[PDB]
Design a protein around this ligand. Structure first.
Ligand SMILES: OC[C@H]1CNC[C@@H](O)[C@@H]1O[C@@H]1O[C@H](CO)[C@@H](O[C@@H]2O[C@H](CO)[C@@H](O)[C@H](O)[C@H]2O)[C@H](O)[C@H]1O
Ligand SMILES: OC[C@H]1O[C@@H](O[C@H]2[C@H](O)[C@@H](O)[C@H](O)O[C@@H]2CO)[C@H](O)[C@@H](O)[C@@H]1O
Ligand SMILES: [Ca+2]
Ligand SMILES: [Zn+2]
Length: 530
């Protein structure tokens, strides 16, 4: 914990809420000054519990770089019209930096450029059958491409495009690595993953392979193009087939006015996947022998079927689908945004379907439960010193995604008549926390803030002779379970929010992932929208 001011190290929006935190004993006066030193705003800090005091300077609407002064402490804060444009663009460009089997030229990628990687055909596990499944994204700090988390990353980007297209219009991805005519930014980026996902479906049965990876993780010091181990397609899985179905049905809708051929192809692929679901058992995935890469296992598969059923309901607008959706909507499944518990994606597709196609009575029950869920998140946020909807027990592996998915839920609900008053405050607080407003004063995104992430568990950043890591990567964040050797040795006994270390070997607190950037893209685009 540093002895300083804790604030949003990226900046504050002219019209947004503006807050800073300090560990203090009592209220103190504070001032905001122009770079010369003249006071422009003054106020008194107020208690928020657990050693914390806050200062609110929301009413300062003049853009600029200000010196915030409290006690003997100083901080430089930025107020701007589009304070989050650069970070949103870097968070979206991260997916292009993760591209597999694609030359990333220096004019686009800069020092983090590299040649086409993993270009060989993959072998179907337990067969001699080879299959070409290039493209898409390296999942995270490793090079595997896993279907289940890929579905979440795609759905989050499609949702961000559906909700906030104007915010997204101001950002530029690695445009020259993508096919022309160029689509809106989130759609152009997500199409690379959608194209790869289509190659993961077995033409014979409609089933989808769980993942394509090397048999084991290569050393942390491996460049993408030096990873020459043979590629293996792990068996078809129910979770993969169901999450693929839902992501493809969602992409068929969203791409309809932009890429008709892709849209039609995704719609056909989603239906064949749904036919596979109806003919096979809900069997959890487990790594086969000799496969040591990310398992993405899950014993509960009704939420995946719920999402797949609701996605096709909205895709077709056919009331026939509501017969399967509605009983699944009644289950005591957690209503979350993945990667393992995905029911809220289905709830959203259901609630976004024209009313005439669904039971009004079920629809009202669905909306009421969503409001109760958001009230419970609002209560967590009210008791948190940083105003984020988190409890100490939520600081697990990928706790930043847990936070962002929760902010995302409030924002999504606004599109379906569920208007919680805390929605915008929660989104701002999630961004503030992600950008430094936390007990470690840590900005959880590489290349941004005054205390950026410098040593992520990310093979390209470790392996290159740059690190100085690839920018715009959201790290997993604090995980109280100490799920790596560095966390066990250096973070024992520390509070849940302090269970993070910016060390390359801390994969349980400091890895990056396509499905950790995807809710951040949604949340940051929502704030930029306003
Ligand atoms: O670390 C990011 C990913 C890097 N690519 C390999 C993937 O396998 C890895 O995924 C992560 O894999 C972890 C190790 O299996 C998953 O961690 C688990 O996260 C769970 C909650 O998401 C915790 O309950 C559980 O204690 C913890 O083990 C975590 O969610 C999930 O993001
Ligand atoms: O737990 C999965 C985690 O593993 C990381 O690879 C580790 C590997 O598990 C360990 O056995 C070996 O000694 O070290 C490597 C590199 O630290 C992998 O890089 C992560 O993507 C993954 O989440
Ligand atoms: Ca599940
Ligand atoms: Zn690759």
């Amino acid at each position: 914990v540093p002895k300083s001011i804790f604030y949003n190290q990226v900046g504050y929006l002219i019209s947004g809420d503006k807050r800073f935190w300090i560990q203090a004993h009592e209220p103190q006066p504070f001032a905001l000054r122009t770079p010369e030193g003249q006071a422009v705003f003054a106020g008194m800090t107020k208690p928020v519990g657990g050693n914390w005091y806050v200062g609110d300077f929301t009413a300062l609407r003049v853009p600029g770089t200000y010196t915030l002064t409290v006690g003997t402490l100083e901080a430089r804060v930025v107020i701007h019209r589009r304070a989050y444009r650069d970070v949103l663009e870097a968070m979206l460009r991260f997916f292009d930096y993760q591209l597999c089997g694609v030359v990333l030229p220096e004019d686009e990628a800069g020092p983090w450029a590299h040649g086409a990687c993993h270009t060989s055909d993959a072998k179907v596990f337990g067969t001699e059958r080879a299959l070409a499944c290039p493209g898409g994204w390296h999942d995270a700090g490793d090079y595997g491409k896993y279907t289940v988390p890929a579905a979440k990353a795609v759905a989050d980007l499609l949702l961000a495009h559906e909700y906030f297209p104007a915010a997204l219009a101001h950002v530029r991805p690695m445009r020259s690595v993508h096919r022309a005519p160029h689509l809106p930014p989130a759609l152009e980026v997500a199409r690379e993953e959608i194209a790869w996902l289509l190659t993961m479906q077995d033409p014979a049965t409609g089933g989808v392979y769980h993942k394509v990876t090397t048999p084991s993780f290569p050393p942390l010091d491996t460049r993408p193009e030096d990873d020459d181990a043979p590629l293996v397609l792990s068996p078809i899985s129910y979770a993969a087939t169901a999450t693929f179905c839902a992501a493809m049905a969602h992409a068929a809708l969203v791409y309809r006015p932009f890429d008709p051929a892709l849209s039609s192809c995704c719609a056909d692929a989603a239906r064949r996947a749904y036919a596979w679901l109806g003919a096979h058992e809900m069997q959890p995935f487990h790594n086969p022998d000799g496969i040591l890469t990310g398992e993405y296992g899950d014993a509960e598969l009704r939420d995946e079927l719920l999402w797949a059923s609701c996605a096709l309901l909205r895709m077709t607008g056919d009331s026939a689908w509501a017969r399967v959706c509605e009983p699944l909507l009644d289950l005591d499944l957690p209503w979350e945004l993945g990667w393992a518990d995905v029911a809220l994606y289905g709830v959203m597709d259901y609630l976004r379907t024209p009313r005439a196609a669904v039971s009004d009575d079920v629809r009202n029950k669905v909306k009421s439960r969503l409001l109760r869920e958001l009230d419970a998140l609002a209560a967590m946020a009210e008791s948190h010193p940083f105003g984020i909807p988190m409890r100490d027990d939520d600081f697990i592996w990928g706790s930043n995604m847990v936070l962002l998915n929760r902010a995302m839920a409030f924002l999504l609900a606004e599109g379906v008549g569920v208007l919680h008053p805390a929605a915008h405050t929660v989104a701002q607080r999630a961004a503030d926390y992600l950008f430094g407003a936390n007990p470690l004063g840590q900005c959880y995104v590489t290349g941004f803030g005054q205390r950026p992430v410098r040593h992520p568990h990310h093979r390209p950043s470790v392996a290159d002779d740059v690190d100085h890591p690839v920018p715009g990567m959201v790290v997993g964040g604090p995980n109280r379970h100490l799920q790596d050797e560095i966390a066990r040795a250096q973070l024992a006994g520390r509070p849940a929010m302090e269970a993070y270390i910016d060390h390359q070997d801390s994969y349980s607190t400091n890895e990056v992932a396509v499905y950790w950037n995807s809710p951040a893209v949604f949340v940051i685009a929502a704030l930029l929208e306003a």
